[PDB]
Design a protein around this ligand. Sequence first.
Ligand SMILES: Nc1ncnc2c1ncn2[C@@H]1O[C@H](COP(=O)(O)OP(=O)(O)O)[C@@H](O)[C@H]1O
Ligand SMILES: Nc1ncnc2c1ncn2[C@@H]1O[C@H](COP(=O)(O)OP(=O)(O)O)[C@@H](O)[C@H]1O
Ligand SMILES: [Mg+2]
Ligand SMILES: [Mg+2]
Ligand SMILES: [Mg+2]
Ligand SMILES: [Mg+2]
Lengths: 321, 321
Amino acid sequence: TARALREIIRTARETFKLRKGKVGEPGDIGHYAALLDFGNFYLAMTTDGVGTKVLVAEAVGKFDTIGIDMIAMNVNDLLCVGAEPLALVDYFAVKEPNEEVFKQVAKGLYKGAEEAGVAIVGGETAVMPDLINGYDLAGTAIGIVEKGKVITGERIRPGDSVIGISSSGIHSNGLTLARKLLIPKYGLDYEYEGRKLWEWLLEPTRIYVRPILELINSVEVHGLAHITGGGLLNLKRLTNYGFELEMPPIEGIFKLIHENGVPLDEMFRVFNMGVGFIVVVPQEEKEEALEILSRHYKSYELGNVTRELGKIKVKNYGITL
Amino acid sequence: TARALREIIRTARETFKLRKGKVGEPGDIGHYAALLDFGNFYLAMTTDGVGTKVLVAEAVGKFDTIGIDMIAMNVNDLLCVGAEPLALVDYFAVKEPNEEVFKQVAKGLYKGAEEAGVAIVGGETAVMPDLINGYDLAGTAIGIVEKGKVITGERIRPGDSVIGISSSGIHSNGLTLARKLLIPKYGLDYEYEGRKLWEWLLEPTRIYVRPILELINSVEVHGLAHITGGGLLNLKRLTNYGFELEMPPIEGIFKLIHENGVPLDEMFRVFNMGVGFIVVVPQEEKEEALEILSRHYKSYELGNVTRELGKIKVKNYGITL
Ligand SMILES: Nc1ncnc2c1ncn2[C@@H]1O[C@H](COP(=O)(O)OP(=O)(O)O)[C@@H](O)[C@H]1O
Ligand SMILES: Nc1ncnc2c1ncn2[C@@H]1O[C@H](COP(=O)(O)OP(=O)(O)O)[C@@H](O)[C@H]1O
Ligand SMILES: [Mg+2]
Ligand SMILES: [Mg+2]
Ligand SMILES: [Mg+2]
Ligand SMILES: [Mg+2]
């Protein structure tokens, strides 16, 4: 996947000169959102989809929260440059204009937008049954960050505290491995800790806008990472320094996947393993940061930034990424 | 589709109040781009895909122009609120990450971006074979328009001049009808009026940024319409007044589609029929408008806006929409 993308990223970088010295001049590609220079402030913009989570929603006739996943995926990324989310458009590529599916999608769109503080300002509906085997929901979000208040991770230093905010569950990454591994063996109706497998797989992605905007307005923040594709590897997008981490107990759907033979190092690169968002703050700000985040969701002191460049050591599981 | 979309549109309008009085407060949904209030200017933002034209690219193995279709679909829509395109992200949802395909997609991306004057600032690559039967390429673009310079069509008045700019060909709408009607009977190698069927179907969408930016900076412009889905019906989005039009002769791929049994009333509602972009200007600007446009592409005085309401009379074809 990354080797195929090389040609597109290189070409994209060549277009940057088109907006040189002009409104909207961009930063580099590779971070959680693009930054566009509008003088006093940057506009941040990111585009992200839900993934094959939508195939579970279809089987049980419940798209009621898939719009939450879409909104969460986009606005949580905007947070990772320090931006306040403002607006979103949605791209709905569908096999058919199913009024039942669309009515369900609409319910979660409002719930998500209110929690994220964004207006849904437009969108695109593409009915292409020869191209789409289902209902693929994506979107694009923009937000604003003042010049001088971008948070890319360049301020991360060894000794910084690393704090994790609990995920609500599987979120929207790793669904293809989980679907292929569990559904044929167990059935979608398989009951695990009092909920059906489809409920574990469909649990809507958590939205972190309110705790993170409160955090960055109260304490000095050096890095912010939304845990999506790549798992804990997303931390290396913030800094060259290493991490020493104690990850929380493996529970819920992650335990079920693990007990079905996925190696532990693979799942910390694929699933969020209970931690959906990670923040990096100076050690002296650790307790206030935890107090702020713990108002909103269960949060963990995970560990510390080290001088072991490039390594992520999950000490309590004996895994090094 | 419009029926299935009612609950999504209704719900999206209910989210507008989340940004009431804040940066990014939106205008209404329904137009070619969303308008976001940033004080002295609006940010315009739109999201659009290529459509099943990608199936033709995949069947023949030629992907080096669908990046042009994507960028054209998005930046041409930005023009229709009077905005200058600035930046675009691409959403590439694929069955497989083929490096040859991606290498070609990147050539067309660069050419579209340079002609449109936009930087490609990021994007998203979703590998989902259970959900995608090919290579679906879409994107989101943003532009800027100063307060007091928004061109919505509200200034359109009876008597105004209606000018059409030629398309390059089929552009990116109606491909589902053209593919299903023509390929099984003729094959993609069939020769028609000097070109193969696949060349008729894959001709890249024209980009109108340079002629339209010159036009709005030179003359008074009352409305701008990019001719996409719905064909000439897109004029009804600008105004409730009527139109009296003479459309150019039926040529090339539209002629072959017509000869294969699609009535002209349907094709003026599906295909651009030779006109890719329409502008409405007061009659005293008509000749200067034609001068400017004709320096970029073949353009036509199509007709006038009428005091009569709601109808689009294509006079020389005896058709009323
Ligand atoms: N098709 C694409 N076109 C342009 N840039 C892309 C594309 N896919 C990914 N990128 C860029 O590569 C980086 C990694 O993106 P991704 O792997 O989706 O992670 P994330 O969503 O967390 O940024 C991002 O900065 C993104 O903008
Ligand atoms: N899935 C969606 N969610 C929100 N708004 C949508 C969606 N699909 C279409 N719209 C809105 O409907 C209007 C028409 O959309 P569309 O038919 O794609 O035409 P266009 O690209 O010419 O605006 C646009 O204002 C768009 O923002
Ligand atoms: Mg993302
Ligand atoms: Mg559209
Ligand atoms: Mg469009
Ligand atoms: Mg992404």
